[PDB]
């Protein structure tokens, strides 16, 4: 079973995550979101809402024997938490024009000492997601590695949404290797083209889950491994208060 300097807890409001097999928290770019006000806004921000700075936990998908290498699932931020599952975060988010935040994630998946396989979990700024910024529905190897080009663009070399997955480890990441761990912990600071974001039309960060070494096991072993995640906005700062977005969807 799981041990000692590998047993770890993280308290967020009224939220706390525990793992008995961690490998540490990878802090991307080596910095955390400071929670500082955007220098481009004259209005004072609403910040430090306790009800907002906690972990939102929901399920991603199911890992099976069938997934092939590099098939993935994307979770666009802040969008995934802008709805009902986003609690007061979502509610506040829908009434502000702009949000500036960092992310702290934990993705979870257990198997046994008789299972073999590994996931790659990474977080990437400006990763190409669905149009509508929603979590992918099923695993896909869609539009890797040359991007999506137009129908007719018969001879085009590639499109700007290219993604050479052979290099996905350039992104802040950690491996969820079944023989080693059960959880992966990442944290990223705020990065964007501007001092704060009009989140409505931009999913600036994407949490990506990909298979790199396919699931293997002998008969009688657990057969499908669920994948869940805990996401927490790190010191979000809101500005430009107005009426509700509404069609939140």
């Amino acid at each position: 079973e799981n041990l000692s300097d590998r047993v770890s807890q993280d308290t967020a409001g009224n939220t706390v995550t525990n793992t008995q097999s961690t490998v540490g928290r990878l802090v991307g770019y080596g910095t955390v979101h400071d929670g500082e006000h955007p220098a481009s806004c004259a209005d004072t921000a609403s910040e430090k809402i306790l009800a907002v700075e906690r972990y939102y936990t929901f399920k991603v998908n199911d890992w099976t024997s069938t997934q092939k290498p590099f098939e993935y699932i994307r979770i666009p931020l802040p969008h995934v938490l802008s709805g009902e599952d986003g609690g007061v975060f979502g509610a506040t988010l829908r009434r502000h024009y702009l949000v500036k935040t960092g992310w702290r994630v934990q993705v979870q998946c257990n198997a046994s000492q008789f299972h073999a396989g590994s996931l790659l979990v990474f977080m990437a700024p400006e990763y190409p997601t669905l149009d509508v910024f929603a979590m992918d529905n099923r695993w896909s190897k869609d539009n890797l590695p040359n991007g999506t080009r137009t129908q007719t663009n018969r001879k085009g070399p590639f499109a700007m949404d290219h993604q050479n997955f052979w290099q996905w480890t350039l992104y802040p990441h950690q491996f969820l290797n079944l023989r080693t761990n059960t959880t992966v912990d990442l944290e990223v600071p705020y990065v964007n083209i501007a001092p704060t974001s009009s989140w409505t039309q931009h999913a600036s960060w994407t949490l990506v889950i990909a298979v790199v070494a396919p699931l293997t096991y002998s008969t009688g072993a657990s057969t499908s491994l669920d994948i869940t995640a805990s996401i927490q906005p790190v010191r979000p700062v809101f500005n430009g208060l107005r009426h509700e977005v509404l069609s939140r969807q």
Binding site: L3, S4, D5, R6
Partner: protein, 58 residues
Amino acid sequence: SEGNEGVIINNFYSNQYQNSIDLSANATGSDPPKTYGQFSNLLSGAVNAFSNMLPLLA
């Protein structure tokens, strides 16, 4: 006392040879010497501290 021996000369054989060796045992036991000689096989590298370390699991 002594027996029937009355030679002037020092015994040619030393005592540990001429006689048995009277020993005395103490009630509470006695500790063996620490070592019976210097013959030994040695175990090295038993422990740690120092390598291509702390890349090494917790």
